[PDB]
Design a protein around this ligand. Structure first.
Ligand code: FAD
Ligand code: FAD
Ligand code: ARG
Lengths: 586, 586
């Protein structure tokens, strides 16, 4: 299923209609929709990627001794994300029996719940105090306010990060009298001082985000749109810098407390409501969604993914202006030779860093001409991520009654996910994932070191099998220091043995430069998104993907931006399998 | 004296020997030494800068109502920095009667001691606890260990940041048996648990830094060169993450605690031993040293600083290869037109960001040829800095008995300097913050906002005078939030009135991309420095300046790298006025 053919060759002066650059989720989805709806024959729609793999930031791996998929990138989806959920599960989403679902893609994909674990057993390790994640709720059940080594404002004492986040967003929303009046029925103060909940929909958030005013009379930010305030600016203002320190650390990496757009951060933090929805993954690896869309595209005659082929530049000044608006110059990495593709539409299905790495002197990127394009490319923050998969001969975490889920710390490692145990071998997988709150610089000095971790034999994992992964091992300095932090996080009551295998991915590396993106304060997001899907009025050049999506951090963001671009400029209707009530904006 | 002529015009096909690109301290010093020692006629040595002023990261300003110089960039020097000190004060430095000193530069420069303030009155505000900076010493005088809201290891309890830093460096030095044996006499444990001191010289540090081994058998970093360990990596290892949090926040700007080269950080923290030396500035503004060096150069007929002229690219492939190795293409910013200069030597007197903004496709930078150059350009961290100068109608800080010096906080502002009061007007100047790497994103969302602070009339400061500075005002959001943090830092015992004028510079802006630079762990600094002063053996192309100096953060670093380059490639001797015992390395 994951052996989708990739062509590392070239075809000098190939003449097509639509060049898609990026074999990530948005680029694959674009090519799949175009050929499946028969807008073009598959030989006129071609995908190019510089990688030796399709999928981009989805990359599922199997490590010797562990007969289940680890994730280097994307792990999971939410069933409220209708494009990715329908593509995985079939339709309609109402149908609760998976056997009565109608598949959209042929590839077998087994949806399984994402294990979230037990707050009673999962750890929070902050300023050297070891808590269970439920510690705040247990105190509140006994009429107590849990003390921490953070000096919160007095009115926040005993709040958890979840509860305090909810109270902040509630307070900011309800202080805007227009929001209070129009949406108060969906912004809910429960009975307990700690209980705040939201029933605001995607549609509601789209009405709110551009209008919401910060109404706090002696704040520095008073009477400004929440859109124009950084989320760290806004959190400090509401709960003091000690409050920000608490939320930034206790939130974890899945929680986004960088100084990004506060209007956009609000829905990110409290969800687009329909709370029958849960986190799931794919038994065969989350990258299966990319392989399934790619294979659906590749089953049409003339379909081709050109791998190890890097776009350098593109021009309107070429010999074939009579048949083709654009000449694209690709670098065939295997031969180090340049070749030309001729096309009438270009889809840049790639993030901010990838755009910046293209020739900035051509007609499209030239900053002397297209100052608006360049400003809007710079409208999103490139948030670093690293993934380190570690294989142990046994699940040492079970000694603490931990099955699954995430432990969270202010230590530089930030967070570990206890991924699974192979019931035959007992070999067990931990994910370390980090990058936020300055931890990139801590880890970069260690991951840049030249001396690699050496693989070690375990059950069903021979040196010959493991030596195939020599190249993708973490550094010994990074493994040693992470092991040190895991011992401090879990405490002295559990012995943590050395791992036998690791897998390391740095998503800051070119061409990605980021794990995910975040809208900056002070940009009109509702206007930048349509702009990015077709920057120049007289050019059939489109940007799509997660980076300029309004579901940043998510495959659904990449799919939604591609889908909007398809319906706007490629004359496609909503897919039959996609509910018309799934909101995609203007 | 600061009206040094700048030529914003062009001279198509100008034919010279030495093109210096960067009218910063190093570029000015290069041009001054070359023409003063008559290595070249002044018409054959030309300086080019894209700015509309000389000085680079030295920029002194006067604000209406305040009849003294504020500093946007460099502020002060140490009398152990012999090039900058001799240039300012005259020679020799042994002569302690200033009337028996022989001036080196004619421009009037009045050295005045840098006011350091009173640790009894200066504030430290950490995790919401307000201390006087002397609090740790006062506790130690009463036999006590000052408690803080940081959970230090038990062996560090009651230590100040200074004392704990000294202990860390002592412990690491003395654990290397070769360092213990060879240099133990200069690495001194005093009687009190808190007392550690060093008599290691510039020369001693140059022997030590490349050899020093981290000898800690339980550490992840054991048996690695201290050179190969990030300073945050090393500090956490020695005093725990809570210890790093204490040092990073309590240190201030005086401390560099980013994850940079530990071998280089050691002397940065504990000095090149040479006590009796103090901090000074120049009454006429610290940028006076730049104007003095520039004017000495510009006294020669044919000398020219080409301002508002930006180097784009340079090539060996041009019509005049018989007389001139290199053709330089400059962009004349006033006309947006390109012009050519022909030269046999190129001096890039510019930081990392400036080099990266040049054409990366030419013979020199092209990564297909010179991957080694590119790796060495990336050997230093670009540390962000900004400057916000604020003018108040009175020195509100005097209510707390504060004359001068720095308050330090874990609030995002990090540090403020109480600068001066105009005794006629009483209008008084704060340097609000430089921000830093951690806090760049907190402040950037506010400084990028479009609504600028509105100037307000004060004594000897009319609206018409102030409206000339409309362009360089901080944003309302940045001024309001900094004022909020100043109120929290100082407490409710002082009322802080609104400022009437501000001055904002962001040193992350192109072409600087940094306030200062920091060597990365894992680079052989002793080998990169000589490499950068002449990267290619067959080319008369040189890099000098602070960025690849071993006195990063300092004018002295820029002067020393220019001086070494001059003695190595341009046939100059040490200047007559520079003591032969001033160590300048290999
Ligand atoms: C650590 C991590 C965790 C994540 N977790 C989740 C999660 O749990 N759930 C989820 O739904 N999402 C998650 N995501 C996000 C998800 O992986 C991405 O949003 C999505 O995969 C991005 O799709 P895209 O189309 O933007 O392209 P990308 O995946 O960014 O792919 C872009 C492609 O363009 C190629 N390219 C760039 N420049 C060129 C060039 N010049 N020539 C040729 N090819 C070029 C690249 O090689 C790449 O294949 C996560 C991301 C990361 C990093
Ligand atoms: C906030 C702050 C505080 C500081 N405090 C002190 C202090 O108290 N004492 C001290 O001694 N040092 C201090 N420093 C450092 C000191 O200011 C610098 O180390 C020093 O001025 C750097 O000089 P340089 O020769 O490296 O060049 P720079 O100052 O970096 O000048 C480089 C020049 O190159 C030009 N340039 C770049 N690219 C091009 C191009 N393509 N074409 C043409 N021109 C180009 C730029 O316009 C610029 O003028 C401070 C720095 C900052 C930011
Ligand atoms: N390693 C560095 N460059 N540190 C920057 C510190 C600030 C600089 N020394 C100054 O005097 O303001």
């Amino acid at each position: 299923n994951k052996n989708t053919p990739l062509n590392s060759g070239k075809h000098p002066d190939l003449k097509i209609e639509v060049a898609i650059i990026g074999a990530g989720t948005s680029g694959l989805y674009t090519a799949y929709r175009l050929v499946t709806d028969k807008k073009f024959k598959a030989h006129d729609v071609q995908i190019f990627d510089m990688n030796n793999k399709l999928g981009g930031r989805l990359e599922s791996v199997i490590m010797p001794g562990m007969n289940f998929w680890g994730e280097l990138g994307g792990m999971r989806y939410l069933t409220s994300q209708q494009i990715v959920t329908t593509l995985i599960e079939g339709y309609p989403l109402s149908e609760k029996d998976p056997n009565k679902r109608t598949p959209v893609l042929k590839d077998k994909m087994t949806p399984v719940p994402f294990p979230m674990g037990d707050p009673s057993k999962l750890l929070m390790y902050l300023r050297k105090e070891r808590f269970k994640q439920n510690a705040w709720n247990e105190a509140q059940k006994k009429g107590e306010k849990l003390p921490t080594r953070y000096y919160l404002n007095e009115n926040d004492l005993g709040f958890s990060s979840d509860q305090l986040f909810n109270k902040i967003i509630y307070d900011v929303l309800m202080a805007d009298p227009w929001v209070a009046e129009t949406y108060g029925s969906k912004i809910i103060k429960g009975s307990s001082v700690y209980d705040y909940s939201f029933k605001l929909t995607s549609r509601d958030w789209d009405d709110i985000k551009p209008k919401l005013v910060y109404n706090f009379p002696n704040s520095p930010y008073d009477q400004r749109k929440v859109n124009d305030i950084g989320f760290w600016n806004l959190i400090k203002d509401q709960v003091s810098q000690e409050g920000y320190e608490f939320l930034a650390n206790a939130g974890g990496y899945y929680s986004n407390t960088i100084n990004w757009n506060s209007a956009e951060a609000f829905p990110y933090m409290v969800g687009d409501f329909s709370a029958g929805t849960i986190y799931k993954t794919i038994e065969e690896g989350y990258d299966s969604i990319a392989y399934a869309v790619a294979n659906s595209y590749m089953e049409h005659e003339g379909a081709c993914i050109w791998s190890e082929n890097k776009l350098l530049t593109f021009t309107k000044d070429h010999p074939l202006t009579n048949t083709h608006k654009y000449e694209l110059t690709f670098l065939n990495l295997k031969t180090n030779t340049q070749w030309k593709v001729y096309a009438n539409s270009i889809v840049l299905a790639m993030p901010r860093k990838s755009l910046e790495l293209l020739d900035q002197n051509n007609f499209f990127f030239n900053i002397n001409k297209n100052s608006v394009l360049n400003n809007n490319i710079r409208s999103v923050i490139m948030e670093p991520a690293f993934a380190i998969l570690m294989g142990f001969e046994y699940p040492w975490w079970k000694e603490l009654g931990i099955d699954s889920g995430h432990s969270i710390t202010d230590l530089p490692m930030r967070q570990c996910y206890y991924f699974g145990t192979d019931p035959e071998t007992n070999n067990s997988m931990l994910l370390g994932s980090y990058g936020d709150m300055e931890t990139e610089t801590f880890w970069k000095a260690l991951s840049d070191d030249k001396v690699l971790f050496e693989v070690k034999a375990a059950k069903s994992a021979s040196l010959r099998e493991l030596h195939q992964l020599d190249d993708v091992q973490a550094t010994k300095l990074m493994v040693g220091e992470l092991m040190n932090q895991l011992r401090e996080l879990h405490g002295d009551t559990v012995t943590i043995p050395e791992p036998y295998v690791t897998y390391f991915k740095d998503w800051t590396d070119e061409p990605f430069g980021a794990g995910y993106h975040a809208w900056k304060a002070g940009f009109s997001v509702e206007n930048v998104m349509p702009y990015m899907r077709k920057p120049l009025t007289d050019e059939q050049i489109h940007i799509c993907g997660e980076a300029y999506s309004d579901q940043q951090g998510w495959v659904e963001g990449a799919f939604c931006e591609a889908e909007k671009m398809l319906q706007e400029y490629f004359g496609l209707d909503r897919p039959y399998w996609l509910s018309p009530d799934y909101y995609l904006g203007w």
